[PDB]
Amino acid sequence: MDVLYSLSKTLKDARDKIVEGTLYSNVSDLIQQFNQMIITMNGNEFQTGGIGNLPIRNWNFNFGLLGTTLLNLDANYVETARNTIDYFVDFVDNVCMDEMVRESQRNGIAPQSDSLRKLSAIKFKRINFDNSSEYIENWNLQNRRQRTGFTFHKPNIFPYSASFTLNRSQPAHDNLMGTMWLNAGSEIQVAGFDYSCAINAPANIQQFEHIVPLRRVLTTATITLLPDAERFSFPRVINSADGATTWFFNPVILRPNNVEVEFLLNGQIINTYQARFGTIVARNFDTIRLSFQLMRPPNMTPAVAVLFPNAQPFEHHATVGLTLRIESAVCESVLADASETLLANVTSVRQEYAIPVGPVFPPGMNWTDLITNYSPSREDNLQRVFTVASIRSMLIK
C-alpha cells in the first residue's frame, strides 16, 4: 500500500517537476527517486484484472534510467521520460482498480490483489518516498495503532431515514401527537406535532424528544442548529404506520421552547446547549439527543384563537421543529462526505467493470446500507478501498 502510494506519487512528481527548461537542481532528487523506481520494477512481471469485466493484463518492465548531469532539462529529456511515465501510470491505474474491486470478509486491511501482494514484498520497500496525503498518513498511523483522524466537510454519517412516531393516535387519525424526522447525510430535520395544541396537556406543554445514535464517534464537529423543520411545514398525506390507510397533516408552525440539544458519548453528556441556535460545537459524541416542546400560547389574537379550538375538530395542527446540520467533523473511521470523491470512485469502478457482489460490501456500494451496518470488517475494507482510490486519484482525473 505504501509502495503503491509511492509509485503513484513518484509518477505525479515526474509529471509535475520534470518539465522542459527547469534547472536540474530542482529535480535531481526526484530523478534519483524515479530511477530507483525503475530499477526496482525492472525485471518483474505483474498480472492485473480477471475479476468481472476488468481485463486481464500482463505488465513487464525494462526501461532505461534518466540522466543526472544536465544543467537544464530540455525537450529530449522530457520526451524520453514521458513514455516510461505513461506506462507506469497505466500500470498503477490498473493495480489500483484491481485492488478496489476486491474485498475480504477477514483480513480486510491486507492487500487482496495479486499485484499488491507482490508489491508488499520487501525488495519493493526501496520505493517508499514520502507518505504525505491524509489517507496514507492515517493508514500508516492506524497500522502503528496510533490515534488517527479524517476531516470531513458534511460527513455522510446518518443513513437515510424518513419516518414518524405517534405517541397519541387512533384509527381516524384526526387527533394525533408525535414526531416526524428525516435523517440524511449530515442533516437532521425533526418536527413535533400535536393536533390539540396542548389544550389538555399539563401546563399546556407537550414534550418531544428525538435520539439519533451515530454509527461512529465524531469529534471536533461544528454544527448549525435552526428552530424550524422546513421539510415538515406543509400539508401532507401520509401512509399510516402499517400502510393500511392515509392521514392528513396540516401544520401550523410555532416556535419550539425549552430547546436543548445534548451530544453524548457512551451515555455521558459531553455537550449540552439550551435554547442556543446557530453555530455550536460538539467535541466528542456518538449520540445526539434533541429535546424541544410545544407550549400553547397563553395569549392569542382572534385569528390564532380561531385556528386553535378546544373541541375535537382540529383543522390546523400545531408543529415545532429543529434543523441540525453537521458542517464539518473529524472521525477515526473513514466516511463519505461532500468534498471527497472516493466513494464515487470505488462505486464507479465496480459498476463500470460489473464486479460480482462480494461477501462484505452491499451491492453497488450502497452507502445507506453500508453506514447502517458499518461493522469493523466493513470499516477495514472501506478504508483500504478508499486509500487505493485516493492513490489512483493522484494520477487519474
Partner 1 sequence: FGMQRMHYRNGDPQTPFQIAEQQIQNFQVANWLHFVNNNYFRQVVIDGVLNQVLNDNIRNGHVINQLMEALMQLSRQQFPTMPVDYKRSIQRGILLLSNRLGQLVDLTRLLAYSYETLMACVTMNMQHVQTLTTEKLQLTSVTSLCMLIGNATVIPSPQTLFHYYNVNVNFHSNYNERINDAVAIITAANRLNLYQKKMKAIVEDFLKRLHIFDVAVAPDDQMYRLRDRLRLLPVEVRRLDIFNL
Q: Pick the binder of partner 1 from 58, 62, 132, 301 (CB under 8 A).
A: 62
Give me the least distance between CB of 210 and a copy of itself, in Å please: 19
For a copy of itself, the binding residues in 372-391 under the rule CB under 8 A are 373, 375-378
Instruction: Give the one entry of a copy of itself, partner 1, none that residue 34 binds, where binding means its C-beta sits below a cut-off of 5 to 8 angstroms depending on kind.
Output: none
For a copy of itself, the binding residues in 289-348 under the rule CB under 8 A are 297, 299-304, 307, 316, 318, 327-330, 332, 336, 338-341, 343-345, 347-348
Assess 39 for contact with partner 1 (CB under 8 A).
yes
Q: Pick the binder of a copy of itself from 49, 159, 192, 256 (CB under 8 A).
A: 159
Q: Report the residue number, 69 or 299, with the smaller CB distance to a copy of itself.
A: 299
Instruction: Mark the segment that binds partner 1 (CB under 8 A) among 69-77, 94-102, 162-170, 373-381.
Output: 69-77
Q: Find out whether 153 is annotated in a ligand binding site.
A: yes
What are the φ/ψ torsions at residue 377 (nearest 5 degrees)? -65, -45
Q: How far apart are CA 181 and CA 369, in angstroms?
A: 19
Residue window 246-285: x/- pattern of binding to a copy of itself, with contact defined by CB under 8 A: xxx--xxxxx---------xxx---x----xxxx-x-xx-
Instruction: Give the one entry of a copy of itself, partner 1, none that residue 367 binds, where binding means its C-beta sits below a cut-off of 5 to 8 angstroms depending on kind.
Output: a copy of itself
Instruction: Write the CB contacts of 148 (distance below 8 Å, at least 6 apart in sequence).
Output: 138, 141, 142, 332
Q: Pick the binder of a copy of itself from 234, 258, 274, 312 (CB under 8 A).
A: 234
Assess 35 for contact with partner 1 (CB under 8 A).
yes
Residue window 17-36: x/- pattern of binding to a copy of itself, with contact defined by CB under 8 A: x-xxxxx-xxxxx--xx--x
For a copy of itself, the binding residues in 337-366 under the rule CB under 8 A are 338-341, 343-345, 347-348, 351-352, 365-366
Assess 129 for contact with partner 1 (CB under 8 A).
no
Summarize as ranges the residues that interact with partner 1 (CB under 8 A).
Answer: 24-25, 28, 31-32, 35, 39, 62-72, 74-77, 80, 123, 126
